[PDB]
Amino acid sequence: NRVFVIGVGMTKFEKPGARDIDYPDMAKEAGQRALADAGIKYSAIQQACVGYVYGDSTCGQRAIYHSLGLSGIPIINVNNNCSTGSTALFMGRQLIQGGLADCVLALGFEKMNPMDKHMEVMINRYGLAAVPAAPQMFGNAGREHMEKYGTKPEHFAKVAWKNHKHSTNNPYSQFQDEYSLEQVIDSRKVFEFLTLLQCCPTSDGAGAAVLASESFVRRNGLEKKAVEIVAQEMVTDLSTTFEENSCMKMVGYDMTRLAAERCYDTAGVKPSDVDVIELHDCFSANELITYEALGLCPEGKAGELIDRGDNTYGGKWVINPSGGLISKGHPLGATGLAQCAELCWQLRAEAGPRQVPGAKLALQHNIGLGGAVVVTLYKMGFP
């Protein structure tokens, strides 16, 4: 059963506390935008998949009833206790592909040892969207990459530089200013080579997408905006031995690798066919290694990809035309849906000053709560 994204919407992603509204109004802004984009009645929504991290188990329902009105539809919380976190989009896709609904709303929102203690305080005071282990794990993985392949600390700063430069054209991004490479390098130290401008900040915001079956799209004449999910794969923790483990593997390198390989196989495409990417750059180090995990270049060649400008406009792949988590900030529940919104706009040729000319195949890379990796390929459903 083919599955399509037929409307998308988001709020601006803002510094926590910059905007004086509660999570239900954020959800309403994103949700109502997505429904208006889709051009459908609210009653067409048969289930809602809702992604958020903080608050109790009723926040999903509270957000949906405020956005759509009260109904008896199922409201599924993506983040449960006794399973690894999914994503709103992966779950919505599952409901459609398995025949449990013809049309669904995916919605996400968020409203905010000596070294672990030190990182905990730093994350709080610098407003980073990270758990205390994360900067250390991603720094270790980047250092490991430098040791094996000769990547330079400036390559990681260049990735971050590139994300901030893209952000200048995204009005939904918390940060929309270009910093110099020198400013990236000189910003406050977080861990090792990682500096503040290489780490994703917290943002408050919401995102939403309407997902629909092939028959729903045909029945309602919605072919024009229908972006097809041509492949989507999730990989949860891979269990390995002491001898095979590495810092790169510990932050999900092989999970991304396998998820993407399986997408490529399903869709019958290769990395070189992808035109535009939105990936999970929680740290610059995760983006750099993810270039190789996705198969964009051979192992150890990310520094060359970076120095050629093959991650930006005029290069082979335009990566994070949004500015990335690094510029947008990371409202935990909403991040994946914002990536989706941008890639759908790119493929629909509605991305304005960020438009990748002639984009036809888009790749999303996202991480769930708990660390599961989701890779998704999109193309226009009926070009």
Side-chain angles (χ1 to χ4, degrees):
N1 290 236
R2 294 167 78 198
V3 180
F4 306 82
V5 186
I6 65 170
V8 296
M10 51 182 299
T11 72
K12 186 177 169 173
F13 283 13
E14 299 194 57
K15 187 163 191 175
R19 195 187 172 181
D20 182 51
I21 59 160
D22 49 41
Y23 74 85
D25 270 328
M26 296 191 327
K28 182 181 174 184
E29 178 167 282
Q32 296 202 342
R33 286 169 173 182
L35 282 151
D37 190 39
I40 62 169
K41 297 163 118 79
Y42 286 22
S43 57
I45 298 307
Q46 295 174 309
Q47 302 204 38
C49 298
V50 186
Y52 61 102
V53 176
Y54 306 124
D56 79 20
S57 69
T58 73
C59 296
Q61 281 177 103
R62 287 166 185 272
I64 292 295
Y65 302 154
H66 185 73
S67 304
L68 301 197
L70 181 71
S71 76
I73 70 174
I75 297 157
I76 298 164
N77 292 333
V78 168
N79 294 322
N80 64 65
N81 294 320
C82 22
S83 129
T84 200
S86 191
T87 72
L89 225 31
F90 185 93
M91 192 164 281
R93 195 256 330 142
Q94 288 182 286
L95 296 177
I96 302 297
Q97 201 199 286
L100 305 156
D102 246 1
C103 175
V104 305
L105 182 60
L107 175 75
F109 61 78
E110 214 73 63
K111 180 95 193 290
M112 302 304 297
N113 185 245
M115 185 64 160
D116 290 320
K117 178 55 169 181
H118 185 72
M119 290 296 104
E120 183 165 48
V121 178
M122 187 187 279
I123 287 159
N124 178 64
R125 300 191 171 194
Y126 297 177
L128 301 183
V131 305
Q136 315 171 68
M137 318 221 319
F138 286 98
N140 290 345
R143 172 59 57 191
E144 180 177 277
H145 201 273
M146 295 192 270
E147 292 164 337
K148 301 185 184 224
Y149 302 119
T151 310
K152 302 292 183 187
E154 74 181 308
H155 286 125
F156 297 90
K158 275 175 198 174
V159 168
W161 174 84
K162 178 272 290 171
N163 280 319
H164 289 293
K165 176 180 141 266
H166 290 176
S167 80
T168 66
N169 288 320
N170 186 4
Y172 296 95
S173 182
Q174 179 175 166
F175 294 99
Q176 300 169 35
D177 296 311
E178 182 174 357
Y179 297 88
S180 65
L181 181 63
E182 297 67 32
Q183 284 172 324
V184 174
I185 295 156
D186 293 345
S187 55
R188 289 211 182 281
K189 190 166 155 300
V190 171
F191 177 81
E192 244 257 42
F193 71 91
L194 289 170
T195 58
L196 196 58
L197 287 176
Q198 301 185 59
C199 304
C200 66
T202 56
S203 275
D204 289 348
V210 182
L211 273 54
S213 65
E214 187 185 352
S215 69
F216 183 98
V217 170
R218 293 296 202 186
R219 174 155 92 253
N220 292 276
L222 301 176
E223 289 87 350
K224 175 91 172 181
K225 302 188 177 183
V227 180
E228 191 169 0
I229 299 170
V230 298
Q232 182 178 66
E233 294 283 347
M234 184 189 286
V235 175
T236 64
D237 210 82
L238 294 169
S239 174
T240 200
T241 57
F242 176 76
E243 303 97 298
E244 290 184 63
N245 214 348
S246 71
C247 297
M248 284 175 58
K249 292 173 184 177
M250 284 168 204
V251 294
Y253 180 94
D254 274 335
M255 295 154 67
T256 298
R257 180 171 69 80
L258 295 191
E261 288 175 2
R262 292 167 189 180
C263 286
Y264 294 146
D265 193 345
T266 291
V269 304
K270 299 187 281 199
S272 57
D273 302 315
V274 173
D275 304 310
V276 61
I277 298 179
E278 283 286 326
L279 60 66
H280 197 98
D281 60 311
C282 46
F283 301 87
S284 61
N286 202 36
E287 176 158 347
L288 187 146
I289 72 182
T290 296
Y291 296 164
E292 293 171 12
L294 292 176
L296 303 192
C297 58
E299 289 77 358
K301 297 289 169 76
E304 297 185 29
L305 189 165
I306 291 158
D307 293 335
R308 279 146 210 247
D310 275 336
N311 59 358
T312 193
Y313 298 91
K316 181 53 172 163
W317 297 281
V318 178
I319 306 185
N320 297 334
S322 69
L325 276 61
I326 276 165
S327 309
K328 293 180 276 191
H330 181 26
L332 306 187
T335 282
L337 287 155
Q339 295 180 314
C340 182
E342 175 67 10
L343 301 171
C344 282
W345 291 328
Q346 290 289 347
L347 296 173
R348 286 158 48 176
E350 296 179 54
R354 309 173 302 288
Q355 184 63 48
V356 173
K360 285 174 197 292
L361 179 62
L363 180 154
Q364 184 177 350
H365 164 263
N366 187 216
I367 297 175
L369 187 70
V373 176
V374 182
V375 174
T376 310
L377 300 173
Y378 299 97
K379 299 188 79 190
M380 294 306 292
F382 314 85

